[PDB]
Design a binder for this molecule. Structure first.
Ligand code: HEM
Lengths: 618, 104
């Protein structure tokens, strides 16, 4: 059984994967739910405070409870077949040990100094463990309706320069040993295995790198630990042995939760997308160094297309399409990368903002540039093989010629320059957080034409690429467009009260898409502007999943088609209706567009799903 | 909005990941002091996602009203976990409280 934000709960039999239960509503948004030990009941926690224990078979309500001063944190039926109790944590910090055989609570239990994080009955029904943000375990004596034991948790020792003394551990999951005789837990940067019966620490499984745990899950089999540290980092660790077994890429939205089968042979994976992925236990252990890194740059030189990649462990590997030809390289984790014009070189940024340009002919030859307060942002090369150009936290736009080691700067006096692009001339287009659409010069810094198209930041600005005849931008205000000849845009489109978020020019035509936040596109003729039929690519959908963001538009060479890419690719026919809408991406959330000069093949990698290559046939 | 109710909502739903006082520490989320009239992703000393860092909007009542209804929808890929405040009144109250407290 899974609930949701709607607060309806749906109960299902996983095998045949077919609806086995529909529940009409739960008052207030569901907070959590759970089966009875004999699966004869289903408790349902909620913000309302209506502990609705519906029958698991008839589906009709049986038990119901309320006592909490605040919203319930957790509900669970007694693991014992005999005793019928309902331990319930809540934001009011008070535990409520319900007697399921009675309408009123068997025992209120103040104890936690912070709101309860999780709650479970102990295999010994006489005992009742509990957890909370203070992090200390609390093994209550339910039989006496009184405190018995409560391990302190400062075991995550960490002597930082932090003014706070010993760290205040915040345990989340209340994991149990398969016998339940001891309590596995996890918090911050470390898993622990406390022995509540002796009231002392035993195990301590450190998590990957350092941060603060968002989710964790012990596995009684194989001493496994499926832990979602942060950003859906659902690694498969191995407890006690204290070493990772294997990586598990594949949830979008950063997981929302995971739990193993009672057999332990499988586990569910609830996620923010609204998705639950079943998984076999065996598959996770095996290694699978795949699924390229989420953001990459690909450069297309004809018949074979090469995609930029970040190594699964360290730097990078270049894998050409239609081949197994890996091209690994070494560096202390490159921040970003860029190939030189007319090939012959390769380059990368750094966390310090330093930017090396390794030669292809010889690994010994390189130039390293030290610049920028932080990691370098945008990087672009001149039409000449020489002269690096870059930007970052600095207000200035860096122009560092390599070999010559020249350091020309674009002194824009901005808080920072957000991004910049090459113009067909010696001019260098740019824009910052003040939303100025500056027109500088390449190599030599010189702000020749200056535009203030937006008081706010330039959200997405696209330049057409035939001559320098036009350029346009939209930034949650107006879709301005100019020919550079004027200091102000030739037209200021105002056809969208919801304000256009992004725009892209036609492939040497007269079309000009204007993307909305909801993925809506409004095509505009490159002639001041006129009420052209909106491309209107998405009309009916909802908040389902993999849909947010109007990242890019890829016009067909014919110009008769727009390749919209938000939650998934859809080839919306230009002006009214759609052409080849179909597709549907596995990853979702593509953020980049690459097109071959021919325009035959575009491959998208979205959400780290992987890179997908398309090659239409006859 | 009702600033007092807004405070309650902040205490209940935001305080576990964010401070509003000047020099208040970064918790899971960034300190919100000075939020109004500031562009997304600018609290110095907080490491944002690229999505939040590049949303490119100015925080103010209109943008907050939309964000707080459904953060993920407004900034897909945000690492902020929050379903959203579905009732407008509560949103207005919270926003009115934040407007006061994040300047104070
Ligand atoms: C109604 C209550 C909340 C309010 C008013 C609030 C306010 C905000 C705002 C305005 C931002 C973006 C500001 C900016 O771009 O600098 C933000 C980001 C964030 N919030 Fe919240 N927040 C709330 C609840 C939460 C909760 C419950 C969590 C965690 C449980 C959280 C953690 C975060 C994080 C991690 C970010 C950074 C987003 C990113 O870097 O991708 N917030 N919050």
């Amino acid at each position: 059984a899974s609930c949701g934000a709607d607060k309806t709960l749906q109960v299902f039999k996983a095998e045949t994967g077919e609806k086995l239960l529909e529940i009409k509503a739960h008052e207030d948004e569901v907070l959590c739910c759970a089966f009875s030990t004999d699966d004869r009941f289903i408790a349902t926690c909620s913000v309302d405070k209506k502990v609705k224990i519906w029958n698991s078979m008839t589906g009709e309500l049986v038990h119901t409870y309320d006592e909490h001063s605040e919203q319930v944190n957790c509900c669970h039926f007694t693991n014992s077949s005999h005793h019928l109790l309902l331990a319930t944590g809540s934001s009011d910090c008070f535990l409520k040990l319900w007697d399921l055989n009675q309408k009123e609570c068997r025992n209120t239990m103040f104890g936690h100094t912070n709101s309860v994080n999780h709650c479970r009955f102990s295999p010994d029904d006489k005992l009742l463990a509990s957890c909370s943000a203070d992090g200390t375990l609390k093994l209550w004596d339910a039989t006496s309706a009184n405190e018995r034991k409560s391990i302190n948790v400062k075991q995550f020792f960490l002597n930082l320069e932090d003014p706070q003394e010993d760290m205040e551990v915040i345990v989340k999951c209340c994991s149990w040993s398969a016998d339940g005789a001891r309590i596995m837990v996890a918090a911050k940067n470390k898993i622990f295995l406390f022995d509540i019966h002796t009231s002392g620490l035993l195990g301590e499984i450190h998590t990957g790198h350092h941060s603060t745990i968002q989710y964790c899950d012990f596995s009684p089999q194989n001493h496994l630990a499926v832990v979602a540290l942060s950003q859906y980092c659902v690694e498969l660790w191995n407890t006690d042995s204290r070493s990772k077994v294997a990586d598990c890429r594949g949830h979008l939205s950063w997981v929302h939760g995971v739990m193993f089968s009672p057999d332990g042979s499988s586990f569910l994976t609830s996620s923010d997308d609204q998705t639950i992925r079943l998984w076999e236990t065996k598959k996770v252990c095996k290694n699978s160094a795949v699924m390229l890194k989420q953001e990459v740059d690909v450069v297309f030189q004809e018949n074979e297309v090469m995609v930029l990649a970040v190594d699964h462990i360290r730097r990078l590997q270049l894998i050409n399409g239609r081949t197994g030809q890996i091209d690994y390289l070494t560096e202390a984790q490159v921040s970003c990368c860029c190939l030189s014009p007319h090939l012959q070189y390769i380059a990368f940024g750094d966390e310090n903002g330093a930017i090396e340009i390794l030669e292809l002919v010889n690994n010994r030859i390189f130039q390293s540039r030290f610049q920028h307060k932080k990691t370098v942002w945008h990087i672009q090369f001149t039409a000449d093989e020489k002269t690096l150009i870059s930007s970052s936290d600095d207000a200035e736009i860096q122009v560092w010629n390599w070999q010559l080691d020249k350091c020309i700067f674009l002194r824009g006096h901005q808080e920072t320059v957000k991004d910049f692009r090459l113009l067909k001339n010696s001019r260098l287009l740019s824009w910052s957080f003040d939303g100025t659409v500056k027109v500088w010069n390449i190599i030599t810094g010189n702000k020749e034409k200056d535009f203030v198209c937006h008081q706010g930041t330039v959200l997405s600005c696209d330049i057409s690429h035939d001559a320098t005849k036009f350029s346009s931008t939209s930034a949650d205000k107006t879709a301005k467009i100019w020919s550079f000849d004027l200091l102000l845009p030739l037209h200021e489109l105002r056809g969208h009260n919801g304000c256009v978020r992004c725009s892209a020019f036609s492939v040497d035509s007269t079309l000009l898409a204007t993307g909305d936040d909801n993925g809506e596109i409004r095509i505009w003729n490159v002639s001041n502007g006129e009420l052209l039929h909106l491309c209107a690519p998405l009309s009916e959908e909802g908040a389902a999943t993999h849909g947010g963001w109007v990242t890019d538009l890829c016009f067909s060479p014919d110009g008769k088609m727009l390749i919209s890419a938000g939650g998934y690719i859809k080839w919306w026919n230009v002006v009214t209706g759609e052409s080849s809408q179909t597709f549907y991406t596995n990853g979702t959330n593509l953020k980049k567009i690459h097109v071959s000069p021919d325009f035959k093949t575009y491959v998208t990698v979205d959400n780290l799903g992987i890179l997908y290559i398309l090659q239409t046939l006859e | 909005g009702d600033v007092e109710k807004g405070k309650k909502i902040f205490v209940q739903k935001c305080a576990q990941c964010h401070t509003v006082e000047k020099g208040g520490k970064h918790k899971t989320g960034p300190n919100l002091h000075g939020l109004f009239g500031r562009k997304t992703g600018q609290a110095p000393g907080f490491t944002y996602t690229d999505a939040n860092k590049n949303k490119g909007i100015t925080w103010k009542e209109e943008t907050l009203m939309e964000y707080l209804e459904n953060p993920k929808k407004y900034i897909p890929g945000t690492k902020m976990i929050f379903a959203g405040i579905k009732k407008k009144t509560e949103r207005e109250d919270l926003i009115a409280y934040l407007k006061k407290a994040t300047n104070e």
